[PDB]
């Protein structure tokens, strides 16, 4: 919650604004960066009738958890392994989003150092 | 101000009503009973400091600033007893307080469900319709000229008279019908 006091009381240019970001290119600084892999097929998660907010890159863990909960009824306490797999992969996706935000912030720090070097050198 | 028998409140009556309201709003402010009891004797000393005040100017002025002390030092929501006006049960059972004259319009088969009650009720109606002219002639001989002064009704005097205007005072419905 300190970043609100860094963007509201400090400056806003070195803080990446969430509504339009990433503004740096993703290949800028990553030599040979690989694409993200979707495990669950589009026809599979169309058959699985997942919610449009639920159709992120890791829908396959949720498909396995819903298949478990359908297949373990009337036991509603037999699917904690699948739920923990899905929640940990959502944790990893949240950490990847944090890394995207911190990537944008440290690259704005890089551009700040670039413009300060230009203002102090030429 | 506005009372049936008396036309006003005396100074002493104002002081007693202020003492009663001050203790009730104190009990509102001072919820627990030992704390209320401690501040109640403190307030008792506060009112009994000026018990013997013979100057009626000074007594009425102490009443006036005591009213202002009460008006600044009251609670917005006092404890109202529920069957008292402002309570959570005042005039609740008036939906069951059916008056007595509706028994006269019953079908005679369901008067024949309570035979002894209506046989006992007709002698009440008999006693009322014989006592009515006796209490009218009791009122018209005792009341002074120009209308009565007080709303205090007189009682019965003879051995055979019932007190005047006694029907809706006796035959009022109960508080739990």
């Amino acid at each position: 919650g300190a970043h609100l006091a860094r963007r509201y009381l400090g400056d806003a240019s070195v803080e990446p604004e969430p509504l339009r970001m990433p503004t740096f290119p993703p290949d800028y600084g990553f030599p040979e960066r690989k694409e993200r892999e979707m495990v669950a097929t589009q026809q599979e998660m169309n058959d699985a009738q997942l919610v449009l907010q639920q159709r992120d890159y890791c829908a396959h863990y949720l498909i396995r958890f819903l298949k478990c909960k359908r297949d373990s009824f009337p036991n509603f306490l037999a699917c904690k392994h699948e739920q923990h797999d899905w929640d940990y992969c959502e944790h990893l996706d949240y950490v990847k989003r944090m890394k995207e935000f911190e990537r944008e912030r440290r690259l704005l720090q890089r551009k700040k150092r670039r413009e300060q070097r230009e203002a102090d050198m030429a | 101000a506005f009372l049936p028998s008396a036309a006003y409140l005396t100074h002493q009556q104002k002081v007693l009503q202020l003492y009663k309201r001050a203790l009730r709003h104190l009990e509102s402010r001072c919820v627990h009973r030992d704390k209320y009891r401690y501040f109640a004797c403190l307030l008792r000393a506060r009112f009994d400091e000026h018990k013997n005040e013979k100057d009626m100017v000074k007594a009425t002025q102490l009443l006036r600033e005591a009213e202002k002390e009460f008006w600044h030092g009251q609670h917005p929501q006092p404890y109202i007893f529920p069957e008292s006006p402002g309570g959570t049960s005042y005039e609740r059972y008036e939906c069951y307080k059916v008056p007595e004259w509706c028994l006269d319009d019953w079908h005679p088969s369901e008067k024949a469900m309570y035979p002894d009650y209506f046989a006992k009720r007709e002698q009440w109606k008999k006693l009322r319709r014989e006592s009515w002219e006796r209490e009218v002639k009791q009122l018209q001989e005792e009341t002074p000229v120009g209308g009565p002064r007080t709303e205090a009704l007189p009682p019965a005097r003879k051995q055979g008279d019932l007190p005047p205007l006694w029907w809706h005072i006796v035959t009022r419905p109960r508080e739990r019908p």
Partner: protein, 87 residues
């Protein structure tokens, strides 16, 4: 719920409260112990007695009837008048 009251019960409870009062002795106290002429009480003590009756039986006596109950038996009769006991 709402237990039915009698004149005997009202009498015994009012006298039981008045025997828990410190400016009234429990040996001179009778069913007609008049509070001003006999028991040596203030009118302020009368107001406290009627307020103890209200806190006792759980209904507010108005001031035009509070200022006139001068004996315990008038209090028994007024609570019987407002509660309809021995129905």
């Amino acid at each position: 719920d709402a237990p039915p009251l009698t004149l005997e019960g009202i009498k015994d409870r009012v006298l039981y409260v008045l025997k828990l009062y410190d400016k009234i002795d429990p040996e001179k106290l009778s069913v007609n112990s008049h509070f001003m002429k006999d028991l040596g009480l203030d009118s302020l003590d009368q107001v406290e007695i009627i307020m103890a009756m209200e806190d006792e039986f759980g209904f507010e006596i108005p001031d035009i009837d509070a200022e006139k109950l001068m004996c315990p038996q008038e209090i028994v009769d007024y609570i019987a008048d407002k509660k309809d006991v021995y129905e």
